[PDB]
Write a protein that binds this ligand. Structure first.
Ligand SMILES: O=C(O)c1ccc[n+]([C@@H]2O[C@H](COP(=O)([O-])O)[C@@H](O)[C@H]2O)c1
Ligand SMILES: O=C(O)c1ccc[n+]([C@@H]2O[C@H](COP(=O)([O-])O)[C@@H](O)[C@H]2O)c1
Ligand SMILES: Cc1ccc(O)c(O)c1
Ligand SMILES: Cc1ccc(O)c(O)c1
Lengths: 346, 346
């Protein structure tokens, strides 16, 4: 693992400089394509993309797991919805399945801790049947967190060897906006009330309890904010750990990763805390409607491309943004050049 | 024309209600897909879409023309760039050409007033070789404005008969952010300084002059803010009129129209002023980096889906947003239903 984190490649400044020069010469006023140009340069800096903004195969990894804190009354969805929805993922009927298909991406359903029997068709990497209730203790041990990190990391970069050049990250797990809020509170240093949201339609009357639970998880576990792995293992969850692992794996592989919503933001905070070298490989997708989204994004210093008020999860936002990444590549490789049309602009 | 404006169909509330009910029953927490759900309902209300959110063929109409006000030193791009770029449109090398291709849409280059010889391959609807200099008088007569409105309207709805169900609007014309700023100032009642931007990389030192020109155009022409056609003919342009015509045509045809950037916003302001019944058919795409974008959008009461800091024009934003409209349709027709999985959520 330490080896893994040590070998994460830095961005290729040489390719980035060649990228900028080429973009500036395209048939358009310099900088007129804004963030689409900035995106193309970012991609060209990623060693796995072979010195140029390109997109081969696309995959969306969905980490599924249950949480013990569900028993604290912080989620109104029946706990079995995690297992049922994970099954539907294999039938291509879920939101991410439909949005991925539209983007020509393949969805990978990974079970990292669903509290139910194994689901055939789903990748089995389950640590246990749900994580511990963070309200009364840790969600898992440090070893378990590190093991899943390494496991997911390997799985991700292994896909790269099969032609995948762009990843999307996602999750599925009733009650996960609670540990996510806890993680965001710890990493950003914001009060719990400022980052706890409604999750999957939690009644306004039940918010207070959710906030108290988050505070309790922090007070009792005392997670160290300067140790991402310590935070993940204490007030996190299997699914959150898994998303963090996809991010480390893709970074080590020198490939881009599209974030999704609020849950992904907390995993990104952990990942950047564990290995800052991961930041250059992260690409935002949409701005989640979850209350703590703004705060999380600011500390990540990210500005989402899509404002859809979405709050579904599954990596649905990620899939929705994939066409945008391909547009930056198409812009780069297919546009004509000013010099060719004898056009001279200041 | 009055007949045209009289026959614009109202939205189908019955289809919209059936849409909402269906969306609420999909495999997801109610409302979790946010604006993607709202979009699907809007589409279902449009008579031309046959009571359901769907997308057949897609077209992007690009209105090209030159402006007399270019002589006031408000644009740093050589005037011939309009004609040259219009030609490149027929070669598929421009920004909108590349983004449209990625979205499977066809680009329609329409010359409504380029100051140059006719360009083969380009649809000819030119009123004159550039419009009058709005700084010293009107850009065109009311008759010319109305004629082009009717002409473009007919062209647009005629395409609908060929299988097109989704339109994108765009333009091309050096110095057009000036008349656009003037129109926005008149319609919103904002001071010129608050809505005049840099356009296509106008040096900060030359902004003052641009603002004075805009004010002069208004003072000398005295456009009536309660008469969209009066505004368009006086301080507008052929390209702006054309975009307004696409919007009226699609509305009459009961079909959706995707706006693009700042120039499109001013044409949308005119269109809604001329016929309020057009509003329900308008769909925002991106948030233009032009200074007056926020003000224009607020008066249109619209919130763009994409934040890309783009300011190219050509309808490039429109094309970029087409995949989003198709995603709302895919969501609607392809997702599974809660009742089928025996899932019951509050
Ligand atoms: O991705 C988001 O921004 C997001 C925001 C709110 C809720 N969710 C989804 O809803 C679940 C978490 O909500 P909850 O109320 O059970 O804590 C989980 O399965 C997520 O996929 C997801
Ligand atoms: O679409 C926008 O928001 C947009 C914002 C700024 C500039 N433009 C493009 O640049 C031109 C207008 O810029 P300008 O400086 O000549 O007034 C015109 O050809 C547009 O296509 C377009
Ligand atoms: C070359 C160029 C100059 C100005 C524009 O608005 C454009 O779309 C292209
Ligand atoms: C049916 C359902 C419930 C909660 C979710 O987070 C989800 O993606 C789907």
């Amino acid at each position: 693992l330490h080896a893994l984190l040590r070998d994460i490649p830095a961005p290729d400044a040489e390719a980035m400089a060649r990228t900028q020069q080429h973009i500036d010469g395209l048939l358009k006023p310099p900088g007129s394509l804004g963030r689409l140009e900035t995106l193309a340069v970012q991609l060209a800096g990623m060693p796995g993309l072979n010195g140029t903004p390109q997109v081969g195969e696309k995959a969306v990894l969905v980490m599924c797991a249950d949480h013990g804190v569900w028993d604290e009354g912080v989620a109104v969805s029946p706990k079995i919805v995690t297992a049922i929805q994970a099954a539907n993922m294999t039938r291509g009927t879920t939101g991410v399945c439909v949005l991925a298909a539209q983007a020509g991406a393949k969805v990978h359903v990974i079970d990292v801790g669903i509290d139910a029997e194994p689901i055939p068709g789903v990748v089995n990497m389950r640590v246990a049947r749900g994580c511990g209730n963070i309200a009364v203790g840790p969600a898992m041990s440090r070893l378990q967190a590190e093991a899943l990190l390494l496991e997911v990391s390997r799985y991700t970069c292994d896909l790269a060897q099969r032609g995948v050049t762009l990843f999307g990250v996602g999750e599925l797990g009733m009650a996960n906006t609670t540990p996510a809020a806890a993680m965001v509170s710890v990493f950003t240093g914001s009060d719990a009330k400022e980052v706890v949201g409604i999750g999957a339609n939690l009644p306004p009357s039940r918010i207070d309890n959710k906030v108290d639970v988050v505070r309790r998880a922090i007070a009792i576990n005392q997670p160290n904010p300067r140790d991402g792995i310590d935070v993940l293992s204490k007030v996190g969850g299997f699914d959150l750990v898994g998303m963090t692992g996809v991010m480390l794996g893709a970074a080590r592989c020198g490939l881009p990763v599209l974030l999704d919503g609020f849950l992904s933001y907390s995993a990104a905070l952990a990942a950047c805390q564990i290995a800052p070298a991961v930041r250059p490989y992260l690409i935002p997708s949409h701005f989640s409607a979850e209350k703590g989204a703004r705060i999380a994004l600011a500390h990540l210093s990210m500005e989402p491309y899509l404002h859809m008020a979405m709050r579904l999860g599954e990596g649905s936002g990620a899939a929705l943004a994939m066409p945008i990444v391909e547009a930056a590549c198409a812009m780069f490789h297919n546009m004509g050049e000013l010099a060719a049309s004898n056009i001279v602009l200041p």
